[PDB]
Design a protein around this ligand. Structure first.
Ligand SMILES: O=c1ccn([C@@H]2O[C@H](COP(=O)(O)OP(=O)(O)O)[C@@H](O)[C@H]2O)c(=O)[nH]1
Ligand SMILES: O=c1ccn([C@@H]2O[C@H](COP(=O)(O)OP(=O)(O)O)[C@@H](O)[C@H]2O)c(=O)[nH]1
Ligand SMILES: [Fe+3]
Ligand SMILES: [Fe+3]
Ligand SMILES: [Zn+2]
Ligand SMILES: [Zn+2]
Ligand SMILES: [Zn+2]
Ligand SMILES: [Zn+2]
Lengths: 309, 301
């Protein structure tokens, strides 16, 4: 068990070699207990652990200890909820608060380079467990996609003197799908996935742990309303991926701005999109619909999720 | 229609808003291999003026999107099922298409790739592969070029040459001209890379004997991947080669094959870790996977 590094790309590989049908995440399961609104608990099959073994060493290759934590965020005690967006605003706020508290703990641990929060949703993208949950990896390395974003963000800031993310968030109007006092959700110009929405704080924040209580309440709303729109823009619930892009631990950055990326994986025609030869083999992406048309369609659908605006 | 560029990653988005049987309108009859224009091209010879926005880089979607119709036979399941002679005709046709793209001198890159399996979205059941002739280098290839060059400056040799010479434990197949191995840095559940033993940068540099031996290495390697998980496995194949049209001492062409079943025969999906973070997980070592693929490969010999 170790973290191997691709010497051509710098990518990391995490090499980590109850009755049937029972839910491991329901209240009363062996590791969950009872009387909780949100539970963060150790992953049964952890990609990273507090006490990783000596890594497998080969002469031409870099290997590092799989030192870290792999956590499951059990989002609600209720098993029969299709999506995060079906939970009340107050419950989503408790989920975000618990994830932030976990990150504050990680920000004390010298071994943690990165706090990666992500969510996979839908049987069609490999999620077999039906209980609402998300994942945290506390890692000894910065995830390669976030490293690339940090390096470009830094170079821009040094070259141009301002945060590029701040400039993008200020400009977004045509592709905006939702905004509140603290958050803007928009289809980026450079969208790659069939329904892609980025959620940014209007104030420059680079760590989840910088967010005020009000910002977290407004975040819960932006997540609920954006995911609600995705659930119906195609007529049936859409599988999606959500990832939090933030600074590395433990210190705020002037040049990087945190954001949630959401990849809705149905085309406008309800056809599932699979990352294949172009995407995985070349890092080339294709769209059969403009980001501008996709923003308009998401925004129209999203009107049916609004309570007062 | 245009190529958009992510300002944070450099990634390019091609924004572009049975047909392959003998007798159909675009195919005709009497052919073994056809290379024809894609009906929905992501790049074209006559792209329109790109959609511009002030903070972003946009490029005209200029190039070619081609379908390689591998056989006139509809009910062939995999490239590996075809006879060596037919696989040689496919590879020869693809190299002839690259020679034209080299001589015409507009394109930056010739990307040859194959998607196989209903489970990864290949609804068309007639065997085919694809070519994108592009005005940009694919970002994954650009990252490999940069790393290959920096190794070359620091060490004086081709890193790919050093890797190929060292591979034994994870070797699944070799012949006079090619080595197929599970890389130490594999990211997909069944991943095999096929390298020429001679340093070659471009598909167009391969001799006829190297093409014949490549047909053999692909047929046998894909035969093994078809059987290793106990049912035919969906896979992605991509050719990583230099940008057009000159070779280099520091970059070495290879095929990467991503077999997308875990050892249990269940589909691996690229999701939040892979697509969100460029982070990859393996529940089996590359070494154990190479042993299983090599064992399966012995039956294919
Ligand atoms: O009893 C279980 C069943 C599942 N999971 C976790 O739920 C996630 C499902 O996704 P996946 O196997 O792809 O995650 P990874 O293991 O790679 O982090 C996995 O991490 C599981 O190990 C768990 O902690 N306990
Ligand atoms: O009548 C058809 C049906 C399909 N295809 C091609 O088969 C490939 C299937 O993959 P995909 O649609 O995902 O490819 P892309 O278009 O993005 O290049 C596509 O290129 C199709 O356009 C075609 O040329 N004609
Ligand atoms: Fe990002
Ligand atoms: Fe490669
Ligand atoms: Zn449950
Ligand atoms: Zn900012
Ligand atoms: Zn056909
Ligand atoms: Zn070489």
């Amino acid at each position: 068990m170790e973290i191997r590094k691709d010497p051509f790309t710098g990518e990391y590989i995490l090499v980590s070699p109850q009755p049937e049908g029972a839910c491991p995440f329901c209240p009363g399961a062996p590791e969950t207990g009872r009387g909780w609104d949100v539970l963060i608990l150790p992953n049964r099959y952890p990609v990273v652990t507090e006490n990783p073994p000596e890594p497998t060493a080969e002469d031409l290759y870099e290997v590092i200890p799989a030192r870290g934590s792999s956590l499951v965020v059990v989002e609600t005690p209720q098993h029969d909820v299709d999506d995060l967006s079906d939970l009340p605003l107050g419950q989503i706020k408790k989920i975000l608060t618990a994830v932030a508290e976990a990150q504050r703990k990680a920000e004390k641990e010298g071994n943690a380079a990165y706090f990666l929060f992500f969510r996979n949703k839908g049987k069609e993208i490999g999620v077999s467990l039906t209980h609402p949950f998300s994942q945290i990896y506390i890692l000894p390395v910065v995830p390669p996609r976030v490293r690339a974003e940090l390096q470009a963000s830094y170079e821009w800031y040094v070259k141009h003197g301002s945060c590029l993310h701040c400039r993008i968030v200020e400009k977004e109007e045509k592709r905006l799908v939702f905004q509140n006092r603290n958050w803007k959700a928009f289809v980026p110009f450079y969208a790659k996935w069939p329904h892609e929405v980025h959620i940014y704080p209007k104030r420059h924040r680079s760590l989840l742990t910088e967010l005020t209580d009000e910002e977290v309440a407004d975040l819960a709303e932006a997540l609920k309303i954006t995911l609600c729109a995705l659930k119906q823009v195609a007529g049936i619930p859409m599988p999606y991926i959500m990832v939090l892009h933030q600074a590395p631990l433990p210190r705020p950055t002037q040049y990087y701005h945190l954001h949630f990326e959401i990849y809705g994986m149905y085309r406008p025609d309800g056809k599932l999109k699979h990352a294949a030869g172009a995407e995985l083999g070349a890092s080339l992406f294709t769209l059969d619909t403009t980001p501008e048309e996709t923003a308009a369609r998401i925004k129209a659908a999203l009107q049916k999720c609004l309570k007062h605006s």
